[PDB]
Design a protein around this ligand. Structure first.
Ligand code: TAH
Ligand code: NAG
Length: 341
């Protein structure tokens, strides 16, 4: 169990103005810290956010949060469930800002909701330095789905924040799960929601990416294959080749037209990962993995995800029999026998 702490700075809030927070389980014999960003889509105007507040309120408010959560997958403290970092300090940061962790706007007389995702991450980091983070050797910022995209948008800002606060020894790294294409749909734009959303959230993107695409075009930096090349921090990318959220937005739910569509989608995703040295991309139809309890089951070319992350740690001290770049080449969902059921 990880125990809830509401932010001491009550001006950093969820959508409805309630305090944001984090769940923490300390491991005093470890100098490794895992900060995990939750996912869960987003909302991009008043009417769409009002609907989310009726039936997804825990993703917009802390008023009903439980005092504990069970750590699972990479957040589990059992060696059998988590071969990678079972002894780390564990942090789960709930997603209550509906802004893909990009926002920096407070509730006010002209804003019905606050969108503070980028500031929530910084304040969590700030308050953890008083509870042990000051002695860390590695800070791994991880996340799934919208939280995976949030890793890509925030990992270099966390690095910069610790540098400016006087902590040069903490190595900041990223792990982005299921947050990696602005492709043509199979049937008939989803990118327009992101464009409109950034403007609604006062959303912020990494500076080098901002400078490449310039004003009005920051939505491009929400797409992994465009923002990843601008990042300095080491980032490991986990992405199913046939991601279910990607297929949903593409309006896919088999004859030749769809067969070619699906095969091209896998081809394109594999192409964008060619020059990503730390990555894990199985040929499966699925979504998310790193906090699922059976995340140890899937393998690419005989290597599990916990093993690949361990090999990544070793590389940041090619390695013999301990690979870090693992991308399926077979071209159809579940041609990898270890895919989830
Ligand atoms: N669940 N998905 C997210 O959170 C997300 C995060 C970053 C960028 C877009 C996202 O979805 C919208 C979308 C997905 C695929 C193609 C176009 C648009
Ligand atoms: C509280 O957070 C707000 C919003 O980020 C910031 O303006 C302010 O400096 C913070 N207060 C303190 C005491 O750090």
């Amino acid at each position: 169990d990880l125990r809830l702490h509401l932010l001491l700075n009550t001006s950093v809030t969820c959508n409805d103005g309630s305090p944001a927070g984090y769940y923490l389980k300390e491991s005093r014999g470890s100098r490794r810290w895992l900060l995990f960003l939750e996912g869960g889509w987003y909302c991009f105007n008043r009417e769409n956010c009002d609907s989310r507040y009726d039936t997804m309120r825990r993703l917009m408010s802390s008023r009903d949060w439980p005092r504990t959560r069970t750590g699972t997958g990479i957040l589990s403290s059992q060696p059998e469930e988590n071969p990678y970092w079972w002894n780390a300090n564990m942090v789960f940061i709930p997603y209550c800002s509906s802004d893909v962790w990009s926002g920096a706007s407070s509730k006010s007389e002209k804003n019905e909701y606050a969108f503070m995702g980028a500031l929530i991450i910084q304040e969590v980091v700030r308050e953890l330095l008083g509870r042990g983070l000051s002695g860390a050797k590695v800070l791994l910022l991880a996340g799934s789905s919208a939280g995976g995209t949030g890793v890509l948008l925030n990992v270099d800002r966390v690095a910069e924040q610790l540098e400016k606060l006087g902590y040069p020894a903490i190595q900041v790294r990223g792990l982005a799960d299921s947050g990696w294409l602005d492709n043509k749909q199979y049937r008939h734009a989803p990118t327009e929601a992101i464009r409109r959303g950034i403007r609604y959230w006062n959303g912020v993107v990494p500076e080098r990416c901002r400078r490449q695409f310039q004003e009005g075009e920051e939505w491009n930096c929400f797409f992994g294959y465009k923002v990843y090349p601008t990042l300095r921090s080491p980032v490991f990318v986990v992405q199913w080749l046939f991601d279910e959220a990607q297929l949903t937005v593409d309006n896919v739910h088999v004859q030749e037209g769809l067969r070619l569509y699906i095969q091209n989608l896998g081809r394109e995703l594999r192409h964008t990962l060619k020059d990503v040295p730390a990555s894990f991309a199985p040929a499966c139809l699925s979504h998310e993995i790193i906090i699922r309890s059976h995340w140890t089951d899937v393998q690419v070319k005989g290597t599990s995800l916990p093993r690949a992350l361990h090999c990544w740690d070793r590389s940041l001290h090619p390695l013999k029999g301990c690979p870090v770049h693992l991308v399926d080449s077979c071209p159809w969902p579940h041609c990898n026998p270890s895919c989830p059921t």
